[PDB]
């Protein structure tokens, strides 16, 4: 009632694209416990890395690392099908516990990060500093990462749909679709949002008949 313990910077994890995903927002009163469900980036993926971040920057590399841990024992499945629940728990003593539970396999991996960990009062105000200074550049980096993920989705999603189709797809359409996927997969390698959107345009137009088949 005269003071509060609060988190001075956001706390979350690295997700696909090297983006920070926030679990506990800046200026939250401790104690506190928040959960979110994540999944696997690629097929038959046996493990995830849980990289813990403190900071307000969107690029994971621009935030302070507090540690990372693996959870393995993820049973083979399509990507985005496994449920990896991540929980950030800060108790009254200012300790952050982070868990990852595979909701199928019941398995679990924690890390404990002392109250003393992370950036000091000075480094904090610097971080808030750069966040506002590089809001623009961070917005750009985000909507490129979103584009890259939309592309990747569209790419993997189409390839699967091409196999389930088999003989059902006209040779012509397969030739044209496979060319666009090869060029998208190339574009995804690079940093040029416009060019990824261009290969995503090229696919939509040539894939019209493949889509129909997926019925």
């Amino acid at each position: 009632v005269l003071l509060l313990d609060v988190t001075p910077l956001s706390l979350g994890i690295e997700t696909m694209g090297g983006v920070m995903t926030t679990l506990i927002a800046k200026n939250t009163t401790i104690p506190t416990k928040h959960s979110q469900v994540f999944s696997t980036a690629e097929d038959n993926q046996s493990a995830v890395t849980i990289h813990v971040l403190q900071g307000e920057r969107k690029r994971a590399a621009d935030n302070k690392s507090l540690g990372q841990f693996n959870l393995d024992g993820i049973n083979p499945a399509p990507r985005g099908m496994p449920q990896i629940e991540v929980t950030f728990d800060i108790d009254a003593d200012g300790i952050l516990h982070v868990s990852a539970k595979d909701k199928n396999s019941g398995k679990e991996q924690k890390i404990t990060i002392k109250a003393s960990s992370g950036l000091n009062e000075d480094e904090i105000q610097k971080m808030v500093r750069d966040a506002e200074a590089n809001a623009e550049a961070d917005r750009k980096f985000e909507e490129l990462v979103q584009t890259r993920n939309q592309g990747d989705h569209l790419l993997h999603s189409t390839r699967k749909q091409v196999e389930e189709a088999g003989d059902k797809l006209p040779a012509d359409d397969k030739t044209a679709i496979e060319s666009a996927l090869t060029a998208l997969e190339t574009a995804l390698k690079g940093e040029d949002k416009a060019a990824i959107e261009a290969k995503m345009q090229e696919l939509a137009q040539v894939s019209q008949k493949l889509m129909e088949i997926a019925q």
Binding site: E14, T15, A41, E42, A47, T49
Partner: peptide
């Protein structure tokens, strides 16, 4: 390895 929503 890597992780997504």
């Amino acid at each position: 390895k890597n992780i997504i929503l």
